[PDB]
Structure 1
Amino acid sequence: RPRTAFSSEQLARLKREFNENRYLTERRRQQLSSELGLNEAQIKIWFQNARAK
């Protein structure tokens, strides 16, 4: 799955979340998806990519 483009707001949330905990659980992935309007797949990819970088 190719990565979508994230808005500034979505990125703001993801960065703060990543800085609290770099690893996702199911419930946290679901909360992010529902609060960000992003597919869970996109959330997982962003976290993986962020750890990679």
Structure 2
Amino acid sequence: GDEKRPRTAFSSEQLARAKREFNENRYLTERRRQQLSSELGLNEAQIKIWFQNKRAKIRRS
């Protein structure tokens, strides 16, 4: 994105991941969220529950 980032906390490589990270949880919410909720047989209180658990993927950090 920018043209002047350090090389410790994130040399853009980590900043770019933040995008791709949500990019896989920003559209599906309105692209496939209906497909899941449909085959999942639940409500919004469970939809987020899936991705909410996937957001960690065994890291809780």
TM-score by length of 1: 0.40
Radius of gyration: which is bigger?
Answer: 2
**Structure with the higher helix share, 1 or 2:** 1
Corresponding pairs, count: 53
Unaligned stretches of 5+ residues in structure 1: none
1:33: how far off?
Answer: 0.7
* Percentage of identical aligned residues: 96
Deviating above 2 A after TM superposition, structure 1's stretches of 4 or more consecutive aligned residues are 1-25
**5+ unaligned residues in a row in structure 2: which ranges?**
none
Deviates more, 1:19-28 or 1:40-49: 19-28
Q: Which has the higher contact order (CA 8 A, sep 6+)?
A: 1
Superposed CA RMSD: 13.0
Q: If the length of structure 2 is used for normalisation, what is the TM-score?
A: 0.37
